[PDB]
Write an enzyme that holds these catalytic residues in place. Sequence first.
Site, short mmCIF file in Angstrom:
data_model
loop_
_atom_site.label_atom_id
_atom_site.label_comp_id
_atom_site.label_asym_id
_atom_site.label_seq_id
_atom_site.Cartn_x
_atom_site.Cartn_y
_atom_site.Cartn_z
N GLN A 37 -12.41 7.92 11.85
CA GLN A 37 -11.66 9.21 11.76
C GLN A 37 -11.19 9.56 12.98
OE1 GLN A 37 -10.55 10.78 8.64
NE2 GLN A 37 -11.05 8.86 7.95
N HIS A 74 6.36 8.91 -4.14
CA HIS A 74 6.45 7.99 -3.23
C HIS A 74 5.58 6.97 -3.09
CE1 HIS A 74 2.93 10.30 -1.67
NE2 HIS A 74 2.82 9.24 -0.96
N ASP A 75 4.38 7.03 -4.32
CA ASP A 75 3.54 5.96 -4.28
C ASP A 75 3.22 5.69 -5.91
OD1 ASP A 75 1.81 5.55 -2.03
OD2 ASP A 75 0.77 7.25 -2.04
N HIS A 95 -4.83 7.22 -4.69
CA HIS A 95 -3.44 7.05 -5.00
C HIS A 95 -2.99 7.56 -6.36
CE1 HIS A 95 -3.80 4.86 -0.84
NE2 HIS A 95 -2.55 5.70 -0.59
N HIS A 143 -2.17 13.20 -5.64
CA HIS A 143 -1.80 13.07 -4.27
C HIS A 143 -0.22 13.22 -4.08
CE1 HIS A 143 -0.93 11.12 -0.48
NE2 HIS A 143 0.02 9.97 -1.08
N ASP A 187 2.31 12.55 3.82
CA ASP A 187 1.74 11.62 3.25
C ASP A 187 0.24 11.62 3.65
OD1 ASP A 187 1.19 9.28 1.61
OD2 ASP A 187 2.01 7.83 3.22
C1 LIG Z 1 -7.11 10.46 6.45
N1 LIG Z 1 -6.12 9.54 6.04
N2 LIG Z 1 -5.23 9.56 5.13
C2 LIG Z 1 -4.61 8.50 4.93
C3 LIG Z 1 -5.10 7.30 5.50
C4 LIG Z 1 -4.84 6.10 5.73
O1 LIG Z 1 -5.09 5.57 6.62
N3 LIG Z 1 -3.96 5.67 4.49
C5 LIG Z 1 -3.46 4.29 4.26
C6 LIG Z 1 -3.48 4.73 2.63
C7 LIG Z 1 -3.81 6.00 3.23
C8 LIG Z 1 -6.40 8.16 6.12
C9 LIG Z 1 -7.41 7.51 7.06
O2 LIG Z 1 -8.35 8.20 7.44
N4 LIG Z 1 -7.22 6.45 7.88
C10 LIG Z 1 -8.05 5.80 8.81
C11 LIG Z 1 -7.44 4.50 9.48
C12 LIG Z 1 -8.13 3.81 10.53
N5 LIG Z 1 -9.65 3.58 9.95
C13 LIG Z 1 -10.67 3.05 10.73
C14 LIG Z 1 -11.90 3.44 10.03
C15 LIG Z 1 -13.14 2.95 10.15
C16 LIG Z 1 -13.51 2.05 10.98
C17 LIG Z 1 -14.52 1.52 11.37
C18 LIG Z 1 -15.53 2.07 10.13
C19 LIG Z 1 -15.22 2.73 9.28
C20 LIG Z 1 -14.13 3.42 9.25
N6 LIG Z 1 -11.66 4.53 9.01
C21 LIG Z 1 -10.11 4.71 9.09
C22 LIG Z 1 -9.38 5.58 8.12
MG LIG Z 2 2.00 4.96 -0.10
ZN LIG Z 3 1.03 8.40 -0.29
#
Ligand SMILES: Cn1ncc(C(=O)N2CCC2)c1C(=O)N[C@@H]1CCn2cc(-c3ccccc3)nc2C1
Ligand SMILES: [Mg+2]
Ligand SMILES: [Zn+2]
EC number: 3.1.4.17
Length: 313
Positions: free
Chosen positions: A269, A106-107, A68, A72, A217
């Site tokens: 993912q 935005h961040d 962040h 970004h 985002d």
């Molecule tokens: C690519 N991307 N870009 C922004 C974001 C994002 O959510 N955010 C808030 C700040 C940015 C992401 C992202 O991939 N978010 C996923 C959300 C749900 N989830 C569950 C696991 C997971 C579950 C069990 C074990 C290991 C891992 N890994 C994820 C990553």
């Molecule tokens: Mg944000």
């Molecule tokens: Zn952001």
Amino acid sequence: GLMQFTLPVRLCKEIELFHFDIGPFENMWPGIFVYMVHRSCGTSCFELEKLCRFIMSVKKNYRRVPYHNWKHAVTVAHCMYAILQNNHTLFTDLERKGLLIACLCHDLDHRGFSNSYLQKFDHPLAALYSTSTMEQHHFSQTVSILQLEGHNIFSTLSSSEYEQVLEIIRKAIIATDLALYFGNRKQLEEMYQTGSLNLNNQSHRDRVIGLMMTACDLCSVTKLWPVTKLTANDIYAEFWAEGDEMKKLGIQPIPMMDRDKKDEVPQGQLGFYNAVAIPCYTTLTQILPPTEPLLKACRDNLSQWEKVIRGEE
Ligand SMILES: Cn1ncc(C(=O)N2CCC2)c1C(=O)N[C@@H]1CCn2cc(-c3ccccc3)nc2C1
Ligand SMILES: [Mg+2]
Ligand SMILES: [Zn+2]
């Protein structure tokens, strides 16, 4: 007046495309942003000296966190730029000013923790703002910087145009709270499918812009796979830091934030491409056909995560 920014050939060409990565040369990002304001808005949108000082005060107020960070913000503004440039005639003058700025800001002053952690830590900011905690702060930091001396990039607007643009920025930053995305996308889906979507309706335009904010985002998912992969590592670096702090508050973090559960990343993912990314870019494509390239790229990355899971990497 006549002092165009110009980028090397490979950059001049590739910046027009959605999947462009802004590169590892921090010193070039301000110039990239200005280039994109100049093409997206006009050389006459902003007094250059003001714009430059605003940008450098914006950059100064991002912190040195894995994800962040200032890169970004500039990444998210370039995705917005490519959407605007691809949908020339859909947006107002105010919208084109407001939205690049909104994205760059935005961040602002993000520390690498979720609204969750602030609330469980009992951070002051969770007392001032009980939902979209960080996003209300990022808006508040944008107003602070706009009110620095020589920093009002909006000085030529009227009292009401200024209020409109700041209201565009405020909604646009709040919408980057992913908790709000689900309900936003579902209503856009119901509106588009039933034909009630109406782009003279301001409450509808707001929804659409919110969906653009989510798309920009998350635009990590729309890059070439090696960018996607190495970005993912920065995202997890933060999430696992927050998990270590959850453990220090005596709380077992969610698996996403637990560094001991790295093995399950690929699966998480897929969940996120299926539950969030793809539906976002799908609905975006329906409202703005020329953003299909984001959907296509996102799908290509879903397939990369499938390959990871079948152990073909
Ligand atoms: C690519 N991307 N870009 C922004 C974001 C994002 O959510 N955010 C808030 C700040 C940015 C992401 C992202 O991939 N978010 C996923 C959300 C749900 N989830 C569950 C696991 C997971 C579950 C069990 C074990 C290991 C891992 N890994 C994820 C990553
Ligand atoms: Mg944000
Ligand atoms: Zn952001």
